[PDB]
Amino acid sequence: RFLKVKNWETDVVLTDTLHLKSTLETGCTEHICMGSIMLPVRTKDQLFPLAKEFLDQYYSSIKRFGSKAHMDRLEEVNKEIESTSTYQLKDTELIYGAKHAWRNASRCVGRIQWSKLQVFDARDCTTAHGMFNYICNHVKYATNKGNLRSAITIFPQRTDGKHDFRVWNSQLIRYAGYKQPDGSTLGDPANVQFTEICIQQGWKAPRGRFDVLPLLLQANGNDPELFQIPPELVLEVPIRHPKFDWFKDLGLKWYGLPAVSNMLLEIGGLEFSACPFSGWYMGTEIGVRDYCDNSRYNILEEVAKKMDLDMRKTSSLWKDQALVEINIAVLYSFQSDKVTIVDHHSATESFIKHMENEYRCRGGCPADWVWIVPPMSGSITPVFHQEMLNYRLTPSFEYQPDPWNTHVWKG
Amino acid sequence: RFLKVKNWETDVVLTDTLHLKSTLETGCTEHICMGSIMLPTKDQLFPLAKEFLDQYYSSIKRFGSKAHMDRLEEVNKEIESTSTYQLKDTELIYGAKHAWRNASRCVGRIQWSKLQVFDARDCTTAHGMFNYICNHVKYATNKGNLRSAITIFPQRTDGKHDFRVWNSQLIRYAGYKQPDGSTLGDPANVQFTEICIQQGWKAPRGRFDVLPLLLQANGNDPELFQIPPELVLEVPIRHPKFDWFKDLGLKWYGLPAVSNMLLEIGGLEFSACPFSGWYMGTEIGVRDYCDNSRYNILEEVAKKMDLDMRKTSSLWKDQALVEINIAVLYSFQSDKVTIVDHHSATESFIKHMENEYRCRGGCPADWVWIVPPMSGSITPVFHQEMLNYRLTPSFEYQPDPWNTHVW
Numbered sequence: 001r002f003l004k005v006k007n008w009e010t011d012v013v014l015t016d017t018l019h020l021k022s023t024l025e026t027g028c029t030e031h032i033c034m035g036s037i038m039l040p041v042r043t044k045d046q047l048f049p050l051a052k053e054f055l056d057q058y059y060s061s062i063k064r065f066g067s068k069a070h071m072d073r074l075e076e077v078n079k080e081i082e083s084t085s086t087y088q089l090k091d092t093e094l095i096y097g098a099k100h101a102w103r104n105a106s107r108c109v110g111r112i113q114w115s116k117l118q119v120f121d122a123r124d125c126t127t128a129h130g131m132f133n134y135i136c137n138h139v140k141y142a143t144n145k146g147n148l149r150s151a152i153t154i155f156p157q158r159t160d161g162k163h164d165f166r167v168w169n170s171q172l173i174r175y176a177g178y179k180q181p182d183g184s185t186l187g188d189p190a191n192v193q194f195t196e197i198c199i200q201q202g203w204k205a206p207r208g209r210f211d212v213l214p215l216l217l218q219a220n221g222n223d224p225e226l227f228q229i230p231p232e233l234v235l236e237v238p239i240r241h242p243k244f245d246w247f248k249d250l251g252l253k254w255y256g257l258p259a260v261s262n263m264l265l266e267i268g269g270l271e272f273s274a275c276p277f278s279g280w281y282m283g284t285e286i287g288v289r290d291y292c293d294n295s296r297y298n299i300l301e302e303v304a305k306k307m308d309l310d311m312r313k314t315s316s317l318w319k320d321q322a323l324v325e326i327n328i329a330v331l332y333s334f335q336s337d338k339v340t341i342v343d344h345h346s347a348t349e350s351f352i353k354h355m356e357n358e359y360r361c362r363g364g365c366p367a368d369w370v371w372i373v374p375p376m377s378g379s380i381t382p383v384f385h386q387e388m389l390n391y392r393l394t395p396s397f398e399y400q401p402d403p404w405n406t407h408v409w410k411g
Numbered sequence: 412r413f414l415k416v417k418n419w420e421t422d423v424v425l426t427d428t429l430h431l432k433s434t435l436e437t438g439c440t441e442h443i444c445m446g447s448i449m450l451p452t453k454d455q456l457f458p459l460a461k462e463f464l465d466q467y468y469s470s471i472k473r474f475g476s477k478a479h480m481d482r483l484e485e486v487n488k489e490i491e492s493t494s495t496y497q498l499k500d501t502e503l504i505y506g507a508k509h510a511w512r513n514a515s516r517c518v519g520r521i522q523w524s525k526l527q528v529f530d531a532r533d534c535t536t537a538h539g540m541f542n543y544i545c546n547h548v549k550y551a552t553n554k555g556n557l558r559s560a561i562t563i564f565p566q567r568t569d570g571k572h573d574f575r576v577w578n579s580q581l582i583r584y585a586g587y588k589q590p591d592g593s594t595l596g597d598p599a600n601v602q603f604t605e606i607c608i609q610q611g612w613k614a615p616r617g618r619f620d621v622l623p624l625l626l627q628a629n630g631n632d633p634e635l636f637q638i639p640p641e642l643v644l645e646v647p648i649r650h651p652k653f654d655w656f657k658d659l660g661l662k663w664y665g666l667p668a669v670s671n672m673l674l675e676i677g678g679l680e681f682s683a684c685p686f687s688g689w690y691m692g693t694e695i696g697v698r699d700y701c702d703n704s705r706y707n708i709l710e711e712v713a714k715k716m717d718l719d720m721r722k723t724s725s726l727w728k729d730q731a732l733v734e735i736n737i738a739v740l741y742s743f744q745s746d747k748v749t750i751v752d753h754h755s756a757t758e759s760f761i762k763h764m765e766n767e768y769r770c771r772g773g774c775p776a777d778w779v780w781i782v783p784p785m786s787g788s789i790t791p792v793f794h795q796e797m798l799n800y801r802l803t804p805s806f807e808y809q810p811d812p813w814n815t816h817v818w
């Protein structure tokens with residue numbers, strides 16, 4: 001079967017055949033669409049078929065499908081599964097797998113970059129201290145003094161689900177949040193609960209608006225342990241505005257390295273529950289979401305106050321006005337300090353070209369419109385007008401529940 | 412079976428059961444989501460009629476009453492004999508209000524029960540259609556104090572005798588291709604603007620020429636009529652701070668009135684059913700003015716603002732977009748023509764959702780259309796999970812008639 005997507009701005013029509021390779025379920029049915037729902041121990045039995053699909057994909061990509069080397073590898077993996085109930089990926093397979101999870105990530109606007117990914121193999125890691133060292137190195141390599149490079153660090157896979165490696169932080173670098181007795185929050189409201197766990201674990205909190213959280217790291221299913229990232233490894237940008245000189249006195253800064261640490265990487269049936277990865281920011285993630293969400297730093301009022309905007313009626317678009325200025329400041333600040341950042345115009349335009357290329361060479365590009373369209377100025381970006389098909393390919397990145405909800409405390 | 416929706420800003424969780432009454436198909440499967448795709452007999456008619464009359468009699472609290480049973484028999488007898496049936500006035504009013512209530516792409520449904528219904532089922536000619544339409548336009552406009560309305564022409568029969576309004580909206584501006592290579596006026600309507608000239612319209616060939624109506628009665632060839640200019644309320648666009656803005660020569664019409672959809676009530680198909688409410692500001696200022704394939708005015712506005720258009724990262728498009736939208740709202744407000752901003756509209760829709768969850772057990776909603784085309788995440792709808800499903804009565808898209816009609 002063949003499915004068409006249309007771009008309503010250009011009349012370009014594309015044909016999807018790749019969706020035929022899709023296995024996992026979407027959440028949707030013929031009766032209900034769940035496209036805006038945020039979240040819609042394997043046996044030998046189910047594992048070998050998952051391994052086989054994967055290795056067939058891998059061997060096709062290197063143009064060796066059906067080769068003696070392909071067949072020997074199937075036999076070898078088969079025999080490893082029947083003997084040990086699991087198997088180990090070769091380095092080449094791990095790299096290919098991790099690149100493809102990113103390529104298959106339908107919510108990611110940054111995928112033009114998928115084939116340039118530094119893979120760090122951390123499968124020999126055994127302790128929390130080991131994990132801290134690997135992560136420090138990842139941070140330093142990725143930051144590259146402002147000239148950001150994409151990377152992922154892959155810790156040992158799940159075995160019986162009782163010995164999982166996990167990073168408890170949702171991102172490697174994030175700011176503390178402190179709920180006050182009067183109901184107000186200091187710092188990032190998104191991180192209150194995690195900040196609380198850190199404090200209970202023995203973190204001494206500075207209690208300011210921008211305290212970089214400590215890493216909380218779990219190796220081999222053990223209770224997690226705290227570590228401070230060396231501050232000299234944590235690149236930060238003070239936010240100022242090209243024309244507004246009072247902007248600096250708001251006291252805003254942000255970190256340069258966005259690095260997701262709470263997802264699960266699946267490759268050929270194997271589950272890597274600790275696989276932190278990082279790229280670089282699109283400006284709107286900080287300027288729109290982190291600064292302007294009501295449940296985040298929520299700076300719209302204060303910025304609009306200082307701007308002397310008419311704040312008495314929403315119909316003045318004071319919020320919209322202040323939002324643009326904040327986002328201008330973020331892009332200007334990163335650019336001035338030579339820290340890699342991309343604006344939402346350039347990022348969406350590059351995504352469109354990537355997507356078209358993927359249709360020509362791969363037969364499709366799964367994409368989640370709800371996420372791909374930026375959270376400001378939607379329809380003046382070309383993605384707004386782009387019909388997209390969303391479906392699940394493996395290898396993949398998956399959401400996993402926060403570990404403090406599941407962990408068996410050992411004491 | 413019982414599904415939950417979460418708002419990620421407020422933590423409010425709502426439970427949906429209304430979807431279990433869902434009937435039509437979405438386009439999506441377990442393998443593929445099509446959420447962002449724009450277009451994804453006697454035996455057949457009676458279940459549809461029964462389903463409808465059951466919900467109608469349930470709504471007036473007479474489910475399983477004698478009047479209920481009597482009406483089901485009457486409609487069944489009429490189908491068996493005539494191969495169709497006619498709605499009581501009460502059933503028409505209810506059906507049309509509920510089609511709006513079930514419209515998952517409509518942010519404005521808080522208003523659903525205040526809908527003036529104009530029964531035009533006795534219409535027989537294009538001239539008749541024109542008279543009903545002018546009356547609709549004048550009633551709804553109300554000198555700027557807009558009132559929601561729909562006018563409903565006769566239902567489909569053998570399908571060779573359809574009533575259709577060929578315009579996509581009652582009021583829209585002409586579009587003309589030029590030797591120059593570019594486009595004058597609204598590029599969205601070029602094709603239609605040509606069909607009108609092909610039918611004998613003398614086009615003024617300006618930037619903002621109100622199009623003629625092109626009305627099809629009883630499956631006949633369609634005819635042209637100019638809406639009396641004094642009935643088309645228009646708004647000149649100025650900025651509260653930028654003096655120069657007015658010199659761009661921009662204006663828009665006050666009445667949005669969708670005329671190309673198909674209203675389905677209890678299995679019956681009303682193919683000409685123009686309806687109207689009032690504008691959310693972004694439709695005009697973001698989409699009509701700034702879409703690249705529309706009036707596409709960002710380039711010119713940014714130039715007057717003397718912004719740095721050298722690089723995309725100066726956010727010059729974004730700055731201009733905001734001012735253009737401030738102007739649209741200000742102009743409408745100054746001339747006392749109803750308009751709603753996207754903040755107030757989306758806030759209203761959240762309240763409507765909560766009302767519908769407690770009262771009805773849910774609210775079908777299409778997040779891709781509900782979230783405004785600017786400033787998405789600073790409106791509350793961005794953070795609201797929504798479930799999308801199809802209920803009847805409903806409004807459905809139908810293809811442009813010129814593709815289908817034979818002359």
Ligand code: HEM
Nearest residue numbers: 102105107108109110113150151277278279280281282397
């Ligand atoms: C290289 C520059 C990149 C840019 C500009 C970029 C852009 C983005 C953005 C804006 C989002 C949505 C962010 C949000 O709203 O939370 C996203 C999501 C995502 N991206 Fe990227 N990305 C980049 C690199 C990467 C890399 C290196 C990976 C993994 C190897 C990745 C995988 C993902 C995944 C799995 C999601 C979904 C996250 C979730 O479900 O929470 N991206 N991308």
Ligand code: HEM
Nearest residue numbers: 511514516517518519522559560686687688689690691806
């Ligand atoms: C009272 C003021 C109203 C407001 C502010 C409003 C708002 C909107 C908006 C912003 C859209 C998206 C339109 C677009 O972007 O093209 C929409 C779509 C729609 N609305 Fe409303 N609405 C109003 C009244 C009505 C009425 C009176 C009806 C029917 C009786 C209606 C039924 C619909 C339908 C069927 C759609 C989807 C149209 C399509 O698929 O093209 N709305 N509404």
Ligand SMILES: Nc1cccc(C[C@@H]2CNC[C@@H]2OCCNCCc2cccc(F)c2)n1
Nearest residue numbers: 038039258259260277278279280281282399
């Ligand atoms: N899948 C889910 C489910 C629930 C929650 C979440 C994280 C939310 C999504 N939105 C806010 C927060 O996620 C914030 C982190 N997102 C950064 C993604 C990114 C950008 C650039 C480079 C790179 F490597 C990675 N995900």
Ligand SMILES: Nc1cccc(C[C@@H]2CNC[C@@H]2OCCNCCc2cccc(F)c2)n1
Nearest residue numbers: 449450667668669686687688689690691808
């Ligand atoms: N369902 C479809 C499919 C294809 C095309 C379309 C019309 C397009 C969609 N997007 C722009 C244009 O629709 C025209 C604008 N629609 C106005 C909706 C509205 C607002 C306020 C009051 C009221 F009565 C009606 N619909």
Ligand SMILES: C[C@H](O)[C@H](O)[C@H]1CNc2nc(N)[nH]c(=O)c2N1
Nearest residue numbers: 036037038370371793794795796
């Ligand atoms: C409910 C809704 O799905 C949710 O707010 C989504 C919408 N789109 C998003 N898009 C991105 N990129 N990131 C997000 O966190 C969200 N949140």
Ligand SMILES: C[C@H](O)[C@H](O)[C@H]1CNc2nc(N)[nH]c(=O)c2N1
Nearest residue numbers: 384385386387447448449779780
């Ligand atoms: C491809 C995508 O579905 C298309 O651009 C949609 C997106 N959301 C929309 N939302 C509204 N309200 N109106 C539209 O015309 C569109 N267009």
Ligand SMILES: [Zn+2]
Nearest residue numbers: 028033439444
């Ligand atoms: Zn879907």
